Amino acid sequence: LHLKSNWSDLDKAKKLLLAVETTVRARVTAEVDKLNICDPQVQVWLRRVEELQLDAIDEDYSQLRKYSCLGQCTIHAHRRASIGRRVLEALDEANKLIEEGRRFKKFGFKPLPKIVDPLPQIKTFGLETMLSQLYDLF
Amino acid sequence: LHLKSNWSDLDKAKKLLLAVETTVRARVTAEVDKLNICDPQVQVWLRRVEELQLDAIDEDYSQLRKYSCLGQCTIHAHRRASIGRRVLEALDEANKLIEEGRRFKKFGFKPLPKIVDPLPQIKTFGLETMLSQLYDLFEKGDSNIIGVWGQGGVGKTTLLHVFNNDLEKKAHDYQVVIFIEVSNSEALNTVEIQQTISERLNLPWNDAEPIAKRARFLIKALGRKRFVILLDDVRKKFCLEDVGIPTPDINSQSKLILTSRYREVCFQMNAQRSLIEMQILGNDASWELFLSKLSTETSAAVEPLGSQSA
Numbered sequence: 001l002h003l004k005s006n007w008s009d010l011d012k013a014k015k016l017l018l019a020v021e022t023t024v025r026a027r028v029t030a031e032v033d034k035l036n037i038c039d040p041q042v043q044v045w046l047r048r049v050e051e052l053q054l055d056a057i058d059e060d061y062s063q064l065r066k067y068s069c070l071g072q073c074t075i076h077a078h079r080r081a082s083i084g085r086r087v088l089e090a091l092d093e094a095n096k097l098i099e100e101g102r103r104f105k106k107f108g109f110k111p112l113p114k115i116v117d118p119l120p121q122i123k124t125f126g127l128e129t130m131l132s133q134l135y136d137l138f
Numbered sequence: 139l140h141l142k143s144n145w146s147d148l149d150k151a152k153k154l155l156l157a158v159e160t161t162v163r164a165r166v167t168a169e170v171d172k173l174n175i176c177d178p179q180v181q182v183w184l185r186r187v188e189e190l191q192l193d194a195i196d197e198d199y200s201q202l203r204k205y206s207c208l209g210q211c212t213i214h215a216h217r218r219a220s221i222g223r224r225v226l227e228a229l230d231e232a233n234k235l236i237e238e239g240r241r242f243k244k245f246g247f248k249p250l251p252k253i254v255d256p257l258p259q260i261k262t263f264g265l266e267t268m269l270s271q272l273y274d275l276f277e278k279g280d281s282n283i284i285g286v287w288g289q290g291g292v293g294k295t296t297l298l299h300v301f302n303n304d305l306e307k308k309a310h311d312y313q314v315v316i317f318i319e320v321s322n323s324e325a326l327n328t329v330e331i332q333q334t335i336s337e338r339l340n341l342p343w344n345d346a347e348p349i350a351k352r353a354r355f356l357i358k359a360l361g362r363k364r365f366v367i368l369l370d371d372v373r374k375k376f377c378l379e380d381v382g383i384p385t386p387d388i389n390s391q392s393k394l395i396l397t398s399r400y401r402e403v404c405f406q407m408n409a410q411r412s413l414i415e416m417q418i419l420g421n422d423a424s425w426e427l428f429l430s431k432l433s434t435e436t437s438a439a440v441e442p443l444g445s446q447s448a
């Protein structure tokens with residue numbers, strides 16, 4: 001019976017993937033604090049991690065466990081194939097994401113300097129006319 | 139007969155796994171002592187080690203050893219398959235945990251700086267009214283710069299400490315609260331302030347970076363965060379952009395709180411309309427504070443009521 005072992009491996013992979021995602025997010029947040037934009041590859045990896053949605057197969061396996069009351073009954077044995085393929089797909093996808101996740105070394109890059117750098121914006125009075133004149137000559 | 143050899147290998151793996159877990163836990167404890175949070179991967183590994191529960195198969199094999207009286211009898215030979223699979227599963231799982239356990243090199247990481255940094259919480263008396271007033275201007279106030287003035291040593295620093303410590307009770311949208319002690323000099327020692335702000339924002343401090351470039355860097359850094367900076371006892375007018383603090387505007391949710399001994403310098407900070415005068419404590423508050431600084435051998439000589447003594 002490989003289904004239970006594979007689902008347990010999926011549980012371990014899910015926990016370890018949560019740990020890896022937490023570490024990566026912490027590093028990316030540290031880079032962001034330094035005025036740096038997140039690395040595009042790391043952003044794609046984060047998107048794939050967020051879109052994994054292991055909760056769906058978790059609830060699906062729970063629903064099957066509701067009917068896992070008799071192994072002998074086969075009325076519900078048809079959906080075992082769906083679980084058997086989806087759990088394996090989630091497992092090897094998670095393994096690929098883990099192997100990629102552990103490998104990043106850079107997590108950000110300095111963005112190109114902005115077109116305009118903000119300056120102090122102290123409240124002004126009656127400067128509209130001369131500002132318009134400056135725009136006119138500019 | 140591979141069962142006995144496999145169980146002996148499981149025993150060796152269990153002992154070596156206990157040793158590995160002890161070493162890893164020692165390293166994690168050392169990292170924790172350094173204010174560092176445990177590495178999530180190491181935490182998951184520790185959880186799996188704790189959830190291994192080799193004692194269960196140990197007792198199960200002992201129960202089988204009670205019936206291990208005859209190899210030939212099939213009465214208990216049925217459970218040999220269960221032992222044969224569970225022992226192997228425990229063995230190769232333990233081997234995987236060992237190979238992973240030996241490989242970690244980092245065991246912790248510096249956590250993100252807290253929303254509020256704790257400050258001394260010396261016991262206060264009769265500060266509730268002015269604390270409520272400070273909250274009123276901090277929340278309702280339409281001006282992002284709040285100025286407080288009063289006589290020297292009337293609790294301005296104490297009010298800032300208690301207010302900053304009380305901010306963690308209430309919920310707010312302010313990510314970072316910064317406490318700055320400007321009264322260290324009248325020459326505006328900018329390096330210490332920049333280091334404090336950089337430390338509070340998890341920024342990597344640099345030694346050879348010029349002051350003006352750092353000021354621009356912090357101005358950009360504070361430009362995306364709703365911050366609450368607490369200047370303490372400012373004594374001369376100084377440009378906020380010079381040190382790196384952006385002057386908050388109505389379009390931003392950041393609030394600036396400063397204290398001073400002089401009304402004029404507070405007026406110079408464009409905080410003329412978030413001004414509160416620090417009134418001295420009342421007679422009842424002064425009396426209840428006075429007892430807190432007296433020994434009972436003296437206090438029990440003064441505290442009791444009813445009987446009147448000089």
Ligand SMILES: Nc1ncnc2c1ncn2[C@@H]1O[C@H](COP(=O)(O)OP(=O)(O)OP(=O)(O)O)[C@@H](O)[C@H]1O
Pocket residue numbers: 260261262263264265289290291292293294295296297321371399427
């Ligand atoms: N409500 C209070 N209850 C108890 N102690 C208080 C209270 N208010 C102030 N203090 C005491 O005042 C002492 C001096 O700090 P305080 O906050 O009064 O100074 P300050 O007004 O900031 O002074 P300065 O003008 O020199 O900067 C502290 O040691 C503190 O114990």
